[PDB]
Amino acid sequence: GPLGSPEFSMPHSSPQNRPNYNVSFSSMPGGQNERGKAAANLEGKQKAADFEDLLSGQGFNAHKDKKGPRTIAEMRKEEMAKEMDPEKLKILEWIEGKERNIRALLSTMHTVLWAGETKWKPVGMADLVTPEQVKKVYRKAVLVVHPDKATGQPYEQYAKMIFMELNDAWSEFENQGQKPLY
Numbered sequence: 101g102p103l104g105s106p107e108f109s110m111p112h113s114s115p116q117n118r119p120n121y122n123v124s125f126s127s128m129p130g131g132q133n134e135r136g137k138a139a140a141n142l143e144g145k146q147k148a149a150d151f152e153d154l155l156s157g158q159g160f161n162a163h164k165d166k167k168g169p170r171t172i173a174e175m176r177k178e179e180m181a182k183e184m185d186p187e188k189l190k191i192l193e194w195i196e197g198k199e200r201n202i203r204a205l206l207s208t209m210h211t212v213l214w215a216g217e218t219k220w221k222p223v224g225m226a227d228l229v230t231p232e233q234v235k236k237v238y239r240k241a242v243l244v245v246h247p248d249k250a251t252g253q254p255y256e257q258y259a260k261m262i263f264m265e266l267n268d269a270w271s272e273f274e275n276q277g278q279k280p281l282y
Contacts, residue, residue: 185257202266202272
């Protein structure tokens with residue numbers, strides 16, 4: 101100091117304002133702008149703290165979500181609890197069986213469809229030894245759950261469950277399927 105030239109001259113005081121995060125790179129300010137014609141905004145999201153106390157010991161057993169993995173599946177975790185109908189429960193057992201073997205998921209999906217679909221022709225486990233057999237049927241398997249046939253229909257929740265799963269392992273089938281699978 102007596103001759104040098106320290107950077108921070110002040111001893112320990114420099115109230116900062118409110119530095120922003122960054123420029124408008126890729127983030128909206130708050131909700132979409134063009135909401136509707138009625139630009140008369142006024143209401144506001146209040147404290148919806150009236151929907152979280154339900155996780156207060158879902159059971160007298162012992163389980164608490166805390167430090168753990170972080171997959172995008174932790175979100176859909178609600179869709180599964182959106183309707184634990186005793187018919188959908190069968191699906192939860194089907195996916196946990198092998199959500200990494202698309203060849204079987206589309207060849208075993210018939211054991212978990214809704215009562216009514218009679219056009220599905222079960223795939224003989226022997227008729228999936230090549231990708232042309234899978235990719236060719238993966239197209240029809242998707243037709244079985246095309247939204248139009250699952251619009252507001254009693255099994256409308258089933259489509260979203262099997263529609264995404266079929267497309268979930270398919271992403272892995274490209275990496276896991278393009279390899280000796282037999």
